[PDB]
Short mmCIF file of C-alpha atoms in Angstrom, two decimals:
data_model
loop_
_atom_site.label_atom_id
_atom_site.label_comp_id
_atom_site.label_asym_id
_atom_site.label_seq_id
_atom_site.Cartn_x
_atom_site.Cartn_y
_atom_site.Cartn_z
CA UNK M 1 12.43 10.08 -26.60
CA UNK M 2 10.58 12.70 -24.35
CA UNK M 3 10.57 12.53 -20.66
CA UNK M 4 8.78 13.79 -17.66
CA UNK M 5 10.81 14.47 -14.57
CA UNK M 6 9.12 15.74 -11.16
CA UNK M 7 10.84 17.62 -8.61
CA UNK M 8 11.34 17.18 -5.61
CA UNK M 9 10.78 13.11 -5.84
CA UNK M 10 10.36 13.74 -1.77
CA UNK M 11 9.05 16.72 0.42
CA UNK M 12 7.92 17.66 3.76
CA UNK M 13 5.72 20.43 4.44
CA UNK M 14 3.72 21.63 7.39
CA UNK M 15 -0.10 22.85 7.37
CA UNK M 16 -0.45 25.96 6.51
CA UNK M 17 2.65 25.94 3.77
CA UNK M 18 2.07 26.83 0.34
CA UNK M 19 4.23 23.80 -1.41
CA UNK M 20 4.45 23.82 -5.35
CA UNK M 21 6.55 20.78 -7.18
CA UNK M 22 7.21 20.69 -10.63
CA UNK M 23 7.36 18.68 -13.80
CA UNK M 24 9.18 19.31 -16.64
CA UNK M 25 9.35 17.50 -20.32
CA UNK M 26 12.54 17.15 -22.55
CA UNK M 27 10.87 18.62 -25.85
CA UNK M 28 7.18 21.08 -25.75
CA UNK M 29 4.33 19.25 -24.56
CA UNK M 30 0.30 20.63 -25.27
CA UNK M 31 -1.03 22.35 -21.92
CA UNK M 32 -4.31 20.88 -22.92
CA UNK M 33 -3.22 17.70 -22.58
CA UNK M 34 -0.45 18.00 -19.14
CA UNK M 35 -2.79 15.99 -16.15
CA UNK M 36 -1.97 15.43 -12.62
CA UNK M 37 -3.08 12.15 -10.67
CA UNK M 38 -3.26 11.93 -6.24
CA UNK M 39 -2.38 9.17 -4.85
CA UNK M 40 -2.79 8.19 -1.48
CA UNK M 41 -1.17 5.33 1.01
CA UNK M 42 -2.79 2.27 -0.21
CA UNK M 43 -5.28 3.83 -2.54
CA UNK M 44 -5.38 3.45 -6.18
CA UNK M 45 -4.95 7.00 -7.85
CA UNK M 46 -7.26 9.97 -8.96
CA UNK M 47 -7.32 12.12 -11.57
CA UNK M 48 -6.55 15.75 -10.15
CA UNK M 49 -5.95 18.03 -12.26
CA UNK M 50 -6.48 18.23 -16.48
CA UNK M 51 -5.66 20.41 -19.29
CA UNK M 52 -3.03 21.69 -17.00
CA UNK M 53 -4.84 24.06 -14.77
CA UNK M 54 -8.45 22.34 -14.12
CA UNK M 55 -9.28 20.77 -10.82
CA UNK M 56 -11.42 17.60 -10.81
CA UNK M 57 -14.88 17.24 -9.69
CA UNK M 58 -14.32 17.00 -5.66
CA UNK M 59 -10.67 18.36 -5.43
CA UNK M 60 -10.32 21.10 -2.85
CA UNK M 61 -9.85 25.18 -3.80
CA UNK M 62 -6.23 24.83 -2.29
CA UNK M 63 -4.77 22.99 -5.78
CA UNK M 64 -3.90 24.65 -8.51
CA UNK M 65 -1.76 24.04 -11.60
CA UNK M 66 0.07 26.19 -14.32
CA UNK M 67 2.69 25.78 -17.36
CA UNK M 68 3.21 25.55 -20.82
CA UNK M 69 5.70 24.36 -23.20
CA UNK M 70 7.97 21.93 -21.21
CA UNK M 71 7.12 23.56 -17.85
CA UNK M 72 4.44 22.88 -15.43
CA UNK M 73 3.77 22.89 -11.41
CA UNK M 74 1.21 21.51 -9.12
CA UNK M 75 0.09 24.24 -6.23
CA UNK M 76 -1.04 23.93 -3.24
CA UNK M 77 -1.84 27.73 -1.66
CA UNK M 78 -2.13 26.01 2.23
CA UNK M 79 -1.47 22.15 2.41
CA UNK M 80 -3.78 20.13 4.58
CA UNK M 81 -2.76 16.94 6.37
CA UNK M 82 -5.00 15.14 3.79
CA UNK M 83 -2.23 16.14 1.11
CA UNK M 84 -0.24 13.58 2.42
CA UNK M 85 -0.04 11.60 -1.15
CA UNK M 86 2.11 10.82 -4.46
CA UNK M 87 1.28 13.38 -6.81
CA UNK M 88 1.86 12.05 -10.54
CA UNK M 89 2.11 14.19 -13.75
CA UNK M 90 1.07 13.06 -17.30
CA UNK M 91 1.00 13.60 -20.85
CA UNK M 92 0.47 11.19 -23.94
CA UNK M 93 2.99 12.57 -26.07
CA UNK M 94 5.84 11.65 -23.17
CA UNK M 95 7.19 8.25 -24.29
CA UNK M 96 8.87 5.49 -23.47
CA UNK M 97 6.56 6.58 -20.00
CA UNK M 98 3.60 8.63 -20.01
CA UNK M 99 3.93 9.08 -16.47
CA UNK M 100 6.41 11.10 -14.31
CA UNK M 101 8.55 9.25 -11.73
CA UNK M 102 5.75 11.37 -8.95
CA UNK M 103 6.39 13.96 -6.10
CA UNK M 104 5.97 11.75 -2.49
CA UNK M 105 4.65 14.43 -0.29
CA UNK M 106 4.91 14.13 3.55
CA UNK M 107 3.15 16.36 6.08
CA UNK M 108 4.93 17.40 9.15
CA UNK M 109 2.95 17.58 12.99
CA UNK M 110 4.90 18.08 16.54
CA UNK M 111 6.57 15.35 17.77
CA UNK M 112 4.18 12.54 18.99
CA UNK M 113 5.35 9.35 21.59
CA UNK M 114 3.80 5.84 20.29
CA UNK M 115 1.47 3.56 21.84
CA UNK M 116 3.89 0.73 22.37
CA UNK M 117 2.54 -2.76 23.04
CA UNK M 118 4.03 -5.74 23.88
CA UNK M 119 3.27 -9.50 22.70
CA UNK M 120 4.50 -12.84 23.91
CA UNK M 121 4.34 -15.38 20.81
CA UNK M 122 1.74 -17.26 20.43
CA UNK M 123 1.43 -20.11 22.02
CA UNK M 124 0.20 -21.95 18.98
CA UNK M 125 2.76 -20.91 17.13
CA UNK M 126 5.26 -22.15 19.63
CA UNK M 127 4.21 -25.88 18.19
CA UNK M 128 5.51 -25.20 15.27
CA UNK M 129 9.21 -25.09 16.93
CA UNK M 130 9.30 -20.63 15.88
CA UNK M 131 8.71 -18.37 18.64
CA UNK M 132 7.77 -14.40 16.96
CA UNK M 133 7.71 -11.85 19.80
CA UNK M 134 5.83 -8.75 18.29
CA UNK M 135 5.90 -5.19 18.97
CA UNK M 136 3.77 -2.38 18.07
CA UNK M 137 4.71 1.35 17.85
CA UNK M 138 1.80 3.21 16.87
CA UNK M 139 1.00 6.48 16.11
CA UNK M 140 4.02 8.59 16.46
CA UNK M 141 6.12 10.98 15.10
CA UNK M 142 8.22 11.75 13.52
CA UNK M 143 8.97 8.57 11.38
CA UNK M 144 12.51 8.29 12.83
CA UNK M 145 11.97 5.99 15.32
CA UNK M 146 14.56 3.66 17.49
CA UNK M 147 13.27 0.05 18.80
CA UNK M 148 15.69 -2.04 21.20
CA UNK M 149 15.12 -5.23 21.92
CA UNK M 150 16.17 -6.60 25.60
CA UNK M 151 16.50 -10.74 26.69
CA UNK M 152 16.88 -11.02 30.03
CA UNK M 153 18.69 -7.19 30.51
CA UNK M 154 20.72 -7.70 27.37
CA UNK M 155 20.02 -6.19 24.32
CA UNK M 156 19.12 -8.59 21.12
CA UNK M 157 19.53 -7.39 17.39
CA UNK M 158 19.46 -10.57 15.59
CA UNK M 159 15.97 -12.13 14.09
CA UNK M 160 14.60 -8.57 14.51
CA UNK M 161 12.33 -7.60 11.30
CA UNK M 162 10.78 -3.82 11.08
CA UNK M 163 8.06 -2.69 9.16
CA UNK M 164 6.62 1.05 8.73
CA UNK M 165 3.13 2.02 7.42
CA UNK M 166 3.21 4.68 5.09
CA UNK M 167 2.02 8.53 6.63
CA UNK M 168 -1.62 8.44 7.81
CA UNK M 169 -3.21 11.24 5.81
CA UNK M 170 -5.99 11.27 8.79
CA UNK M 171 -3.19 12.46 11.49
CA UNK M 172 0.10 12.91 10.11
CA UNK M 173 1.26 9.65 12.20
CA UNK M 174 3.42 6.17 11.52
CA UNK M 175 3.35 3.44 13.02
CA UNK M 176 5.63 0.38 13.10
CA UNK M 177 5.79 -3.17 13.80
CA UNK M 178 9.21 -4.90 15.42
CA UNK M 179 9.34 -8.37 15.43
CA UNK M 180 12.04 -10.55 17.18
CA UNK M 181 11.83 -14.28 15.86
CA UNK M 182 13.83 -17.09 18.01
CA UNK M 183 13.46 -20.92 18.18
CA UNK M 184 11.22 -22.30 20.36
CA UNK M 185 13.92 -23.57 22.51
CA UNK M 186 16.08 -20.37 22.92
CA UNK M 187 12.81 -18.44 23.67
CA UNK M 188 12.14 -20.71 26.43
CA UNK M 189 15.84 -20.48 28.11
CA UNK M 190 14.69 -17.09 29.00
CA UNK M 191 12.11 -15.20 31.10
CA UNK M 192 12.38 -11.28 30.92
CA UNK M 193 11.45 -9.89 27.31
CA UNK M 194 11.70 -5.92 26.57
CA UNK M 195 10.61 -3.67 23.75
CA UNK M 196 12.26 -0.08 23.98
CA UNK M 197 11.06 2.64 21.96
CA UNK M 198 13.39 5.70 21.70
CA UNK M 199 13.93 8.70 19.33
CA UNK M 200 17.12 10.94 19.08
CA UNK M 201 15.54 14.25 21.38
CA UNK M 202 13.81 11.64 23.82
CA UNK M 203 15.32 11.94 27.61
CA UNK M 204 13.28 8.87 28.57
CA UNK M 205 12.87 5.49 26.19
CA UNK M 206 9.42 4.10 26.63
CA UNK M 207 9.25 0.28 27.64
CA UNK M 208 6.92 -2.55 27.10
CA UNK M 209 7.92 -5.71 29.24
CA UNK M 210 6.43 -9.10 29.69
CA UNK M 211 8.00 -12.34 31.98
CA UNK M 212 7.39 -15.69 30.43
CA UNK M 213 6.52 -17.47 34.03
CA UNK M 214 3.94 -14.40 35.24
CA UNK M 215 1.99 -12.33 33.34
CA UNK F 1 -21.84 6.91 -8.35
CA UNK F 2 -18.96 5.21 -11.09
CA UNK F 3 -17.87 2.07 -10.01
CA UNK F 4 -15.16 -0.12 -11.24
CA UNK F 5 -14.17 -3.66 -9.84
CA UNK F 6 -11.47 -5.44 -11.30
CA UNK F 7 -11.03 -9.26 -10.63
CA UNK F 8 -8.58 -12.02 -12.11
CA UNK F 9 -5.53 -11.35 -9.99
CA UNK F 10 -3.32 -14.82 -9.39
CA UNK F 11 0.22 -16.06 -9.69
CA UNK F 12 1.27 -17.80 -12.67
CA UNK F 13 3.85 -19.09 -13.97
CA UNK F 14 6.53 -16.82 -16.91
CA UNK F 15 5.71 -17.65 -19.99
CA UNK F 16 1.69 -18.50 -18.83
CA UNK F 17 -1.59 -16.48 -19.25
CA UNK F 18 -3.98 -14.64 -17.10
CA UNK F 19 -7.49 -12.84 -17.63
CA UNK F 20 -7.91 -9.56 -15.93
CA UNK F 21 -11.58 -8.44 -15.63
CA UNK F 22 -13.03 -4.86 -15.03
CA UNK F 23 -16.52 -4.38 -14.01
CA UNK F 24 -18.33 -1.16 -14.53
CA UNK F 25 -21.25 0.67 -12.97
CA UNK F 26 -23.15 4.16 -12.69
CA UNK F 27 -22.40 5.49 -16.44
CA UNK F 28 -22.67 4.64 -19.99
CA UNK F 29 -19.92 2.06 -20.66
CA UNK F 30 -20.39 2.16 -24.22
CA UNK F 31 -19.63 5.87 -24.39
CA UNK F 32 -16.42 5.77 -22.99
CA UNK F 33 -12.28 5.30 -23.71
CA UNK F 34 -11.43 2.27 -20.78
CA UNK F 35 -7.66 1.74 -19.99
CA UNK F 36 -5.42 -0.47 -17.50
CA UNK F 37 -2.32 1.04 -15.92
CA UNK F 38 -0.25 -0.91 -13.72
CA UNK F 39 2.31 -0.16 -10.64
CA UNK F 40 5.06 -2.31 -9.83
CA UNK F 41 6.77 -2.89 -6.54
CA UNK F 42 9.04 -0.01 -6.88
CA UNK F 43 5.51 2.11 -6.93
CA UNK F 44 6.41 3.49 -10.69
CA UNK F 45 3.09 3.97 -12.69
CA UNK F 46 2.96 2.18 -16.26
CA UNK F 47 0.80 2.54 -18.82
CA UNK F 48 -0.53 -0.76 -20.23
CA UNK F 49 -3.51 -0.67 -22.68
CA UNK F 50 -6.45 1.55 -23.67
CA UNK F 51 -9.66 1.01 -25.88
CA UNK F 52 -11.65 3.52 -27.31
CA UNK F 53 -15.29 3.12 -27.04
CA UNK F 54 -15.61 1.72 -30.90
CA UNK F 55 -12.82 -0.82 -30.25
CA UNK F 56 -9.43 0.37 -31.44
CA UNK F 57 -6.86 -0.99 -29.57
CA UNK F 58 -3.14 0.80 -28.08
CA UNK F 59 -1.08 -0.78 -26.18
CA UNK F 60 2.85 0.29 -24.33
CA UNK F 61 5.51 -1.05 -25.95
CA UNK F 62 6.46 -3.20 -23.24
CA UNK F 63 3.05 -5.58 -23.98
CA UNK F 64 2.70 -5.43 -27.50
CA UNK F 65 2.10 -8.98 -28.92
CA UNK F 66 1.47 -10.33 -25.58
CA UNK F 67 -1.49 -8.46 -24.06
CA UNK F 68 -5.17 -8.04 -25.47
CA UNK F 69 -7.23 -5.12 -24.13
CA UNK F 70 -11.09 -6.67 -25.02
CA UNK F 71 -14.54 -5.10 -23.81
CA UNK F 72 -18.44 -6.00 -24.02
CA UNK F 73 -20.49 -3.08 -24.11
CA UNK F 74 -23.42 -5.46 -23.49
CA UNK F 75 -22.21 -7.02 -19.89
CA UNK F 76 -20.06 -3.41 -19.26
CA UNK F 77 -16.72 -5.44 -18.81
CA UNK F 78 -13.38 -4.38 -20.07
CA UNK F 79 -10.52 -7.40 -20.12
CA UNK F 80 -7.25 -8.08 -20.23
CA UNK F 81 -5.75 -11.60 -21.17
CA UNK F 82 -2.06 -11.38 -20.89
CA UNK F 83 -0.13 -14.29 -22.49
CA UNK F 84 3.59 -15.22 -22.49
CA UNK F 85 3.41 -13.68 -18.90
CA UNK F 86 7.32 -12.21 -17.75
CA UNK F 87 8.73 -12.03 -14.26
CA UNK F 88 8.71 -7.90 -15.33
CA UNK F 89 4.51 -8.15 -15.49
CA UNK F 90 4.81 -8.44 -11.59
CA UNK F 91 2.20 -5.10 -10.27
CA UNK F 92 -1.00 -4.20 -9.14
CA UNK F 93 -3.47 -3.50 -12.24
CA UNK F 94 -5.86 -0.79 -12.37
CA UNK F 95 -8.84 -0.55 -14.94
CA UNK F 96 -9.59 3.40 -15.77
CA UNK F 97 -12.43 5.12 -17.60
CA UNK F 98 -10.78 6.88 -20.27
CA UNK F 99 -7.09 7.14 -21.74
CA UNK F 100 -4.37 8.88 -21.96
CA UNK F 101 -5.27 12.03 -23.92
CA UNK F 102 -8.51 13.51 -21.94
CA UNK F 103 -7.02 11.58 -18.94
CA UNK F 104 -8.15 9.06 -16.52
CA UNK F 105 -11.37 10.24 -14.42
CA UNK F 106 -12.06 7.21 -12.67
CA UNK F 107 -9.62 4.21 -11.20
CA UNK F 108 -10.15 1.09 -9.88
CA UNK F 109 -8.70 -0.23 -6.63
CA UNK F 110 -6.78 -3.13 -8.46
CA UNK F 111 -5.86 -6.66 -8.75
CA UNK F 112 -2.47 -7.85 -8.06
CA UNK F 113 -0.30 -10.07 -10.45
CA UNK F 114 2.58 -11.77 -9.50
CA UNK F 115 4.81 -13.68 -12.58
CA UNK F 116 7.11 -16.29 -10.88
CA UNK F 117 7.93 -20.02 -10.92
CA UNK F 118 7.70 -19.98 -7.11
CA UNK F 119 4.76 -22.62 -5.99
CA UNK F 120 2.22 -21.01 -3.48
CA UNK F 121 2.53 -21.03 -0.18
CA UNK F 122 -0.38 -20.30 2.02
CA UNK F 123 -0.19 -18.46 5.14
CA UNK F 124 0.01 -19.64 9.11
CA UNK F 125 -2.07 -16.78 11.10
CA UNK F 126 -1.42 -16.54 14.91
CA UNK F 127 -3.46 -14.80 17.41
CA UNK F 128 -1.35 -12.10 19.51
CA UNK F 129 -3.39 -11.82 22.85
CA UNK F 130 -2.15 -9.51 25.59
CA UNK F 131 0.68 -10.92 28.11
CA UNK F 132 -9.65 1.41 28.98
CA UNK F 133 -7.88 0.72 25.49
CA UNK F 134 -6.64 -3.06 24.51
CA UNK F 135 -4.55 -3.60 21.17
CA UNK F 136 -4.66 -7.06 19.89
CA UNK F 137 -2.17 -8.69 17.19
CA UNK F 138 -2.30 -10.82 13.97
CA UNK F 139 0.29 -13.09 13.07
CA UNK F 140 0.15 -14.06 9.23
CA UNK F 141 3.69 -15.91 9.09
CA UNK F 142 5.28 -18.06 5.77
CA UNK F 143 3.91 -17.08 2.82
CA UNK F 144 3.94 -16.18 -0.67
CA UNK F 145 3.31 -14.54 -3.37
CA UNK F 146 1.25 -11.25 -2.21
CA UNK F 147 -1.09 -9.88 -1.34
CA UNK F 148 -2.57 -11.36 1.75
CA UNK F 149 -6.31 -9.25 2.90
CA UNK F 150 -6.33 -8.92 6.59
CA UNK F 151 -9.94 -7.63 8.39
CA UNK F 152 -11.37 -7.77 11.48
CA UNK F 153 -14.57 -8.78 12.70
CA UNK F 154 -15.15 -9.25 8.86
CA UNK F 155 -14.76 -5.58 8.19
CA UNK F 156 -17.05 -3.93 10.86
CA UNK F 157 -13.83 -2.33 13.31
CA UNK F 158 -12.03 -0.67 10.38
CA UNK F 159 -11.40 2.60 13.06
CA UNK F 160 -7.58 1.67 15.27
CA UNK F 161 -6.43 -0.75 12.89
CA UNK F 162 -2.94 -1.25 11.55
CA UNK F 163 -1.51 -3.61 8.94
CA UNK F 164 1.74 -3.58 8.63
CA UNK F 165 3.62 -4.47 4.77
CA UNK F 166 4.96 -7.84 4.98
CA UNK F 167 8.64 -8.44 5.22
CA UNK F 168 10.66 -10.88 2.94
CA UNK F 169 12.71 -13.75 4.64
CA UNK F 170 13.96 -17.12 3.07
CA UNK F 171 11.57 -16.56 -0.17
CA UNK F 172 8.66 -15.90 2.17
CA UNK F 173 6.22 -12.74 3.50
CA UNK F 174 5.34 -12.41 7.17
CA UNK F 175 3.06 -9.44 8.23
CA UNK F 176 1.37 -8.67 11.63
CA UNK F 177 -2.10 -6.49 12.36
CA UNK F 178 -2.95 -4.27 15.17
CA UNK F 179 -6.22 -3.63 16.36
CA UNK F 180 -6.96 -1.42 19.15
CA UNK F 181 -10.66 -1.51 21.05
CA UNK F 182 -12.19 0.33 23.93
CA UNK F 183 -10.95 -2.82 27.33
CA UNK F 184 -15.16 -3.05 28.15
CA UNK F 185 -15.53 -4.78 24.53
CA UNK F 186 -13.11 -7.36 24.66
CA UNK F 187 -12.89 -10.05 25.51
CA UNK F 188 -16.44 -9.21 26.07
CA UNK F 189 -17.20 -9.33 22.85
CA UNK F 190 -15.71 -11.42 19.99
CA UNK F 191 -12.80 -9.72 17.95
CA UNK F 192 -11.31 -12.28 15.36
CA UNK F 193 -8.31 -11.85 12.73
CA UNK F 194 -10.00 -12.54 9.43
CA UNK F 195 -6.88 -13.75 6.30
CA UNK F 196 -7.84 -14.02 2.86
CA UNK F 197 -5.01 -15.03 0.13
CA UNK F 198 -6.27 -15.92 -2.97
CA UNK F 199 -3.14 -17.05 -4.55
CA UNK F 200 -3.85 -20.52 -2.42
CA UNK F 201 -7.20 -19.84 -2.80
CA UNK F 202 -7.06 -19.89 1.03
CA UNK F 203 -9.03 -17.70 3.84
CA UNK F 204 -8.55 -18.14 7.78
CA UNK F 205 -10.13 -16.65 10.70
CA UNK F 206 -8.49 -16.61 13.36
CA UNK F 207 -10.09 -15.23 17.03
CA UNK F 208 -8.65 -13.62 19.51
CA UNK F 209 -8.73 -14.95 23.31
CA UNK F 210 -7.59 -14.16 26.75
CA UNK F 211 -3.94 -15.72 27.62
CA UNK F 212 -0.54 -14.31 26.70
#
């Protein structure tokens, strides 16, 4: 039994950084044969780095990798907002997995508000006796974001369903969905509907609001 | 440039089979080591299978007996039929020139496999039409297993999209889309919600118009 572990499992960094994560084996492992895969947000992943210390064909002066023995890092001398990725080491003679459980790197940016838009449900979908109010929150940061739902003045927590991308690697940025699912009836015994966007050092929530009679 | 397709992704039934294919391009197929490596939900890479380029076989321990990694240097496909399917088999497949040793130079982008005794359900998709920038909504409500592919326009406005994973409610997925296009080119011009889920074998388009 020989494992890989990589540390940190999770990090944040901002551009400019140098960042370095590690992988270690239980018993010696060959350098020649210690590899690193990237992988990005809903991307399959590519080979990195090989034989411990060689960058692939396309990867950026910035990486690096060193170690021997049961010992090896990934490096990156000034991490880009592209870094944004999973980085995975791997050897062959590492069993039950060949893999390591991967370093999830995230990439820090100043704060950012998101574009916050507001949907009534469909009105087709409204025949099928479910009423889905939907809320977009996209582009901010950082990724600790607060929706509120309001009926009417009154805040609503129940049928409310969140979803967050993973980091953009383009901007640094998430973005959310919050949807608030009712019957068709208790939608209609209302008219004022409210998405509130709010994070812990905001002064001001932003608000997206829609009245079932006028539009 | 090296391309690799793979194809073949479905649910099935445990205990069922399924044939993966992997189609190569822009090298000499013959010359190379060709593996699969899969990820499952909890994003944890696996090993599965690799070939070297005179046919000898390895395979993980978790696959043995079941799986059979196959190629044909002649059509430059690399295969892999997976019998007694388990619940566990669940993940996104990726075919890979070369193997563990050297490494793995080249992935595909995948094919998804889902292992469950669940019956397909397809999805319902719902236009989400507003109440100089204009973000329009998807609604792809009800179904199961994953993956569904959401586009828009077929493709062409890839720029200000976002697709949000799909959330798990009474044994089924909803997930919403946001697009977001200058206000002079809608609803100018046509922008339509385009749903693909092959597990019903099922695709939907789905346009956008004016009204709440």
């Amino acid at each position: 039994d020989i494992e890989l572990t990589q540390s940190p499992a999770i990090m944040s960094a901002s551009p400019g950084e140098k960042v370095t994560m590690t992988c270690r084996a239980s018993s010696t492992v060959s350098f020649h044969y210690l590899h690193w895969y990237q992988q990005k947000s809903g991307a399959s992943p590519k080979l990195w780095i090989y034989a411990t210390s060689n960058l692939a064909s396309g990867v950026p002066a910035r990486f690096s990798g060193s170690g021997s023995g049961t010992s090896y890092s990934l490096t990156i001398s000034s991490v880009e907002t592209e870094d944004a990725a999973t980085y995975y080491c791997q050897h062959y003679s590492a069993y039950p997995r060949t893999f390591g459980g991967g370093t999830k790197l995230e990439i820090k940016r100043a704060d950012a508000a998101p574009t916050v838009s507001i949907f009534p449900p469909s009105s087709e979908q409204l025949t099928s006796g479910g009423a889905s109010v939907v809320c977009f929150l996209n582009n901010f940061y950082p990724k600790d974001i607060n929706v509120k739902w309001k009926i009417d003045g009154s805040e609503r927590q129940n049928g409310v369903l969140n979803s967050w991308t993973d980091q953009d690697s383009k901007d640094s940025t998430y973005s959310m969905s919050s949807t608030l699912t009712l019957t068709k009836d208790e939608y209609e015994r209302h008219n004022s509907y409210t998405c509130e966007a709010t994070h812990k050092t905001s002064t001001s929530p932003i608000v997206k609001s829609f009245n079932r009679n006028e539009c | 440039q090296v391309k690799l397709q793979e194809s073949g992704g479905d649910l099935v039934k445990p205990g069922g089979s399924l044939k993966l294919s992997c189609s190569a391009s822009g090298f000499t197929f013959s010359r190379y080591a060709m593996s699969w490596v899969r990820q499952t939900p909890e994003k944890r890479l696996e090993w599965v299978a690799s070939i070297t380029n005179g046919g000898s076989t390895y395979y993980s321990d978790s696959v043995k007996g079941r799986f059979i990694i196959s190629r044909d240097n002649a059509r430059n496909i690399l295969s892999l039929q997976m019998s007694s399917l388990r619940s566990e088999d669940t993940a996104m497949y990726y075919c890979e020139r070369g193997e563990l040793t050297y490494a793995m130079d080249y992935w595909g982008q995948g094919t998804t496999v889902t292992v469950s005794s669940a019956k397909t359900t397809p999805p319902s998709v719902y236009p989400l039409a507003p109440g100089s920038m204009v973000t329009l909504g998807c609604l792809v409500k009800g179904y199961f297993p994953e993956p569904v592919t959401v586009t828009w326009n077929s493709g062409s406005l890839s720029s200000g999209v976002h697709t949000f994973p799909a959330v798990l409610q009474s044994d089924l997925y909803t997930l919403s889309s946001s697009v977001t296009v200058p206000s002079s080119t809608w609803p100018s011009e046509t922008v339509t919600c385009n749903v693909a889920h092959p597990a019903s074998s099922t695709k939907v388009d789905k346009k956008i118009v004016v009204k709440g």
